[model samples]
Target chain A: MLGLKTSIIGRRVIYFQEITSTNEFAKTSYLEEGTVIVADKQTMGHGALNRKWESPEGGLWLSIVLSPKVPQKDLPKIVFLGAVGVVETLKEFSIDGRIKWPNDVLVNYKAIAGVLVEGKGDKIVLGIGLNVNNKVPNGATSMKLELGSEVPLLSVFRSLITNLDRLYLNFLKNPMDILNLVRDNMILGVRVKILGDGSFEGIAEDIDDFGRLIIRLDSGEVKKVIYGDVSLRFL
Target chain B: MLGLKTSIIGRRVIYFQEITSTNEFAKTSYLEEGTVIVADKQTMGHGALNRKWESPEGGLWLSIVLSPKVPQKDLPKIVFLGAVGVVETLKEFSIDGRIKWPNDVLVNYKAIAGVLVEGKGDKIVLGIGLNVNNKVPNGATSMKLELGSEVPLLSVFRSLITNLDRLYLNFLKNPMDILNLVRDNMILGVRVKILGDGSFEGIAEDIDDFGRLIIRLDSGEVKKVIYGDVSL
Candidate 1:
């Protein structure tokens, strides 16, 4: 009962009635490399850099801590990894989705899931807040919104765990290979344009080797953007 | 007693009858930046790598975890920092102690205390086994043995903690400055020779700016000793 025995993400799930932040707890524990801590409710939940991540009952609020081989310098890529993983799981139920840079994985431009990466140097922990199986038309979308039926929490969780494990292993072998998969599933190239001060239009040529957005602008220039959001405009 | 208070180390002060290793336990908890864990007996204590550390009762077998500013590449220098702290603390009892490289403090050709340091990335955990209050008869020497009275665990702990905090902070400010201090307190220098395979001799002129021992060999070549044990 103390050990997790699943085949994927929560293969070793630790369910908590409440927690301050699973990321903080994992930092101080020997939770192996890919242990996930699920909390029914978080009293002192927080987003990246001290932002509030409210967790009430009925929300699939939890954090998964991973110690992948990806060097500390390359951790910023987890944002994209989370986005692509979320999209893959969403697509299984025919849910259309788009990714926003640096964190949120959105459904129809509204956030459905997010990931927070924390820790110092080689010791890293990835925190995921997935909104699943909740009633009421809340701010975030759920699998039910796209599937047109109530989704089984266990089934959804199983899919997420399997997908996370597969992606995590791929990250170890070659991060660029995984980023390539994320780029193909991303919508930045087709539906949006990023600007100069914050406005420009071009199909994202592809994410460069370093995982930045490569956009070929109208002025016959290919610009690499390391920050800012993408928007769909009426041509 | 779960929360740590503001002091050099150990806010909770949880004592253990026996543990696999005090340093291992200290690294696994939500210990504040400078928390200390001490055990009366260690079943499987370790020095460095996986080397076993001798831990009998009535000795100061303790570990301290910290978040110091030393860069990851330069972590090996922690041995010097720990040695300086421990040797200085013992020096207070007029034991006439001297330090040997990696981390051993000796008094008159006898082992007094041994220090071990290890960490992951930016955070460091240092384990120290000071021969305090323990009567080894032939194997060890204590402050009281030479000073004629037993030393309290708390008092010795306080002095060691203060010295550690000071030296750790000094290393953070200027690494070279700490290196300079280590060079002067080196117990081995005059008429010394490296023993075993690949042995050499010279004046232990000084430690370099990078924390390496500077040895002027018999052939008049100054070589920097990066690692290995030295003798006088």
Candidate 2:
């Protein structure tokens, strides 16, 4: 009963006893669209900007390989779709999680899950890493850590995959339709400093049609930043 | 703000100051699919099997003219889709309404809305009469009567059209997907009496895939009955 509801996303799922990275393995092959490669544990997990993601035991480390029918400029927003899936799954377990813009999820300001998207030619690899039954690495947290009990990892996996699959298909059909959900769950409208290529100090206003970051600077300039590390700008 | 969120269903809405019936007007012409014909009031509104439906003031008497792509055998379930739309809209107003199976919506065991579907060739006219902002005729009720206030008819109209549009599009993609909502809203697993055509007294069971009423009769018998008068 907890199986996926999508018609395509989890149809041809590949499994591994152990793997270096699901995203890395997925990108090497031009597998069928909606093909999911999952691992019991990842040996070399990565997040945005080559940041080392701790994919310890008792967490879901999965990647979906898709041949999306959208322009390459629209590729950036696909990562936010994965972030939304993780946040939605967290709500099922009574943990109120917030999307920390572009690709991370946090509960009560502590990192819980991460999403990364890589586009190559006509194929895109969407990776999601969520901490479930493992103990938190302190700046981060997990379901078992937050709920004070050992959680069922498979149940979380099933729910998370279903959420991701549903959002992925719908997001492809109408890219603008998911604007409200991503906007509602996002960490925006506050003074912040973006750290990346073209980093600046400004207030993050909103996400634009092409999924770019909208920032309003004190110099009265409205700029759209592509990707970055964001922190609250508090004097 | 509170406008419809649908892309197709309310595309071409035709209004009437007053009419004999929205369904009658809808069936007469070859209107576009998703064309909605709404009337301020209906003089000769009919429900399932020639039963006169009272469409007084402060109510929505509307019909959707569609060109359905499914077979004629699967048409009965389309009526339940309308019943779901009315019930879901009622829920938005904080009123709990149950679908009284096959085609009626009831609030606290009192009739609140009615649905009827008619097919001709590839065209079908789906009619829905939801009682709102009007006084109840004792046996049947309305939205205002349930909430103890004069509710705005346009708000209910907007919400109902949006809900209907959503369910209509999704229900078409997967015919089996809407079974849970119909079954949950149904007045099943309880004793019921059916009238018209094939009458029997038994515990009303489930609605089969074709939307026929399923009943478990007394003295250990199972039966499937078509459209008729249903009582609690």
Candidate 3:
């Protein structure tokens, strides 16, 4: 049993058996910054674009509450920084997982994990969903499947937190530090389409300096997309 | 004694008490859309910029939870719209109130009430503080003071719910309708100085089409102030 005094960073860690959603629980707790809420199971987890994200026990479902006095316009960079952390953590396992536009960790052009960021009440709660030990859900692949057998979720969580803390500290000093790292990642330079009202295809140029994806289309014009899903493929 | 059945649009109203800050309780409950939590007395309540607001025992301190499927860019308008509902409800008592830029209700330069809007999980909860029936705090006044010693919170909440429901419905249908009304009711046409950072004066030229206060400064330029305190 890990006592409250065990971890200096995760001193206020609260574990629940089944929660409606960790993000929802963390919000009401009025918890101090760095409060970690981990749920053994999240019955009603939701991802970006209102997609259902299931957590059937073997997956790690947690939300970290962060209180940083960041300007509203620059807040979106935290999402980009989180993507870098997630992708790098996967790479440590020889997964070669790269980030897609917005917030998805993709391995061989398929999603293995995702990050969801939300802001309210003078704080931002980031939810991380990683399929570590569980068998991958129907349209997904787990690290275990690619590596032959199950890897310990504790080790995966340790790597994830280390990467996340690094990126988070880097962002506090200079947001551009993380932005430059995201630009260097450059996985979305390929062809992709944004699905929404009247979808369109364009070359994924790069996420702009302000965390927007700058898409250069075949017709020779560029557009910066802030919120949307990207389906990247070869034309 | 209003039954378990609720009157607010799409909400389940449990009870309305004039108590302390509603934001405190709303933060605790698993809020559903249109849930209106009202308190008759508020011990501690505040507005943006950390200004104190009084909610004496007989006054109205209420918060409502709203879930609108709108882009976050449009969140400021939700606060503006809530101020409209508050001001309209006060006008029913014949206490003409004007809305300052973001969320202040004033009766001829004296702040009568204020609104604090907070977005929670899957819902936006707005707390309203008004001086309804009680004696105004040492530094405030209310409709009861200007009109009479008795002001009904039940009446205020009823009309508030009605007006809020109607305008919120209009917001979902055509937001432009409420936006125009807000543009006309704002108290921005006067000479005002942007508080903090320095002394600067700007005439309230017009409200942008999105309900933001557009101040035409003496420098022949316009300033769109998002988050800051204002003084006349």
Candidate 4:
């Protein structure tokens, strides 16, 4: 039993021992909004650019369906809400994680988890993969390794769904507030490199109200990056 | 034999006697790119904003799959191409149909046909519902009523597919060329109302490169409407 405390976000829970990819399954599954899908392992998990995502057995790989009554351009806020929900749940485990622009959670300069948001028509699927009690690769860490003990997976799911429910409600009331919470936990004030649109370096300043990242470039000109892959390093 | 000339678009065809919505069916259907789906009658056909689209018997209710190797922003040109294809096909019937911005094809101030473009992930379904030999509701006319006889549906389908094949090839070669064809037949320099983001009246100036409607508002200001219900 998931025993989810969230009233609206994750009312129905579907668990699979293994799936090809939670987002891919969600796309054609015809599930209702607020339905939560989780898998023990993913055979072909992927991120934004179809890069392989490490979703091992112990990692929490899940996706939630969101039929938000927001404008199409405002859907990026849902991704930010997911990151904030993840960070809030990680805080409960005493694992301090920070959000990178777009939606990657980093702990101690290593990726602990990632979020992928895919939309089709009015349906938006927000998929999250967090390392809970698994061995991760590629500069990734897990809650088990960070805390030196295996945490109960059910407890983490409860906290995550609860936080997700709360943040989604608050998001509908005032999206900027939820964005600010995510912005506060962001890894800011550091030299960053943005990829996919030509390499450029800038100081990560702040996330704008429109959910765009405001970066102060080396040329003393501020650039607003909407969606891209970003890497941060100390200058 | 249905002699189709297109190489990529409409290579495969699926026909149905009745269905709910072609676009909806196409989205969940795992078909290859360039597949075409046609239904004789749609029990519950609808347009943008779910407005009821009348799909009776003898009408051409069909959808084409487009797996373009283009960016998402450039997809609107496909809608314009569909309009151009329909208007060019109408010429074979000696019926002149002009295009309204986005996707409405009108004949003598009445909409003879319309197009609906829906995208999901990497797939885009371009649906065309042309009132061929059926009785249409609202301010809609059929090719049959206009021609005063039952035009063979196969002949119309052939012409439509052939024109679509040619225009699609030209579009892949030079998209602006296709836009220019759509522009030359537009209902421009006329008062029109856009029905979204708070209704407003403006003169329909032109369609931009990105397939946006450039409306010069009454306030001496120009507004580019990206997505909305436009009525002339």
| Clash count per candidate | 7, 0, 9, 0
DockQ of each: 0.01, 0.01, 0.01, 0.01
Interface RMSD of each: 14.1, 21.9, 17.0, 20.1
lDDT of 2 by residue, A148-201 (tens): 887777678778778888888887787776667888898887787776554678
lDDT of 1: 0.67
In the range A12-43, model 3's lDDT, one tens digit per residue, is: 45445457888877766677676667766678
**Candidate 2 off by > 4 Å:** A1-235, B1-4
TM-score of chain B of each: 0.83, 0.95, 0.89, 0.95
Which regions of candidate 4 deviate over 4 angstroms?
A: A228-235, B1-232
Say what the interface RMSD of candidate 3 is.
Answer: 17.0
Over B25-134, each residue of candidate 3 has an lDDT whose tens digit, in order, gives 77777766776766555566767656667666667677777877866667678887778988899888887888887788888877788788887777788777777776
List the pairs of residues colliding in candidate 4. Answer: none
Residue pairs with colliding backbones in model 1 are: A9-A161, A189-A204, A194-A200, A195-A198, A195-A199, A195-A200, A196-A199
Q: Label model 2 with its docking quality class.
A: incorrect
Best candidate per lDDT, number? 4
Fnat score for model 4: 0.00
Residues B197-224, model 2: lDDT tens digits: 5578999889888788888988889888
Best first by lDDT, ranked = 4, 2, 3, 1
Model 2 iRMSD vs. native = 21.9
Candidates 2 and 3 compared: the better one by lDDT is: 2
CA error at residue B161 for candidate 4, angstroms: 57
